[PDB]
Amino acid sequence: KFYIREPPHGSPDWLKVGLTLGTSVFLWIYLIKQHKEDVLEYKRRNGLE
């Protein structure tokens, strides 16, 4: 212990850390799925594949 008073950010807010990581992962997987669906729909509509 160094600080006379406990710092507000003494230990990581694990709830916030988990929410942040989960939100990032969810957004990334959603973006990947959305891109795949967009490519498939574009190819189907243009009659390419």
Binding site: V17, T20, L21, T23, S24, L27, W28, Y30, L31, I32, Q34, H35, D38, V39, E41, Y42, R45, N46
Partner: protein, 121 residues
């Protein structure tokens, strides 16, 4: 307002169904990479303002910055591409339907075109 009030336009629709026929932006698009760069810069500025180690602290927060910027950038690029495609479609259709306004012109070669010569001396 040029393209506002265009026939068949659904209000408050970020992307209509007719935009699904266009090629979606590649995930490695330079514009998407620039959106990610903007997100990373925002994270660094956040660390600097809150007086944390700029490059070390808040890795989860920086990752969320980058991911959010890339997400919104992807959707923004889709809308931008759709609007430009719509403009090109309308311009081509109008030129096709107004031939008296956009007439083909006979092409004269430079052997037949007379241009004045101004010497440099």
């Amino acid at each position: 307002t040029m393209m506002s009030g265009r026939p068949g336009r659904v209000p408050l629709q970020f992307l209509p169904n007719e935009a699904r026929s266009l090629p979606p932006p590649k995930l490695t698009d330079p514009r998407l990479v620039y959106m990610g760069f903007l997100g990373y810069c925002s994270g660094l500025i956040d660390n600097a303002i809150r007086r944390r180690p700029v490059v070390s602290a808040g890795l989860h927060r920086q990752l969320l910055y980058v991911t959010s910027f890339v997400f919104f950038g992807y959707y923004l690029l889709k809308r931008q591409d759709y609007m430009y495609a719509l403009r090109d479609h309308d311009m081509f259709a109008y030129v096709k339907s107004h031939p008296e306004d956009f007439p083909e012109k006979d092409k004269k070669t430079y052997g037949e075109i007379l241009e004045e010569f101004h010497p440099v001396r």
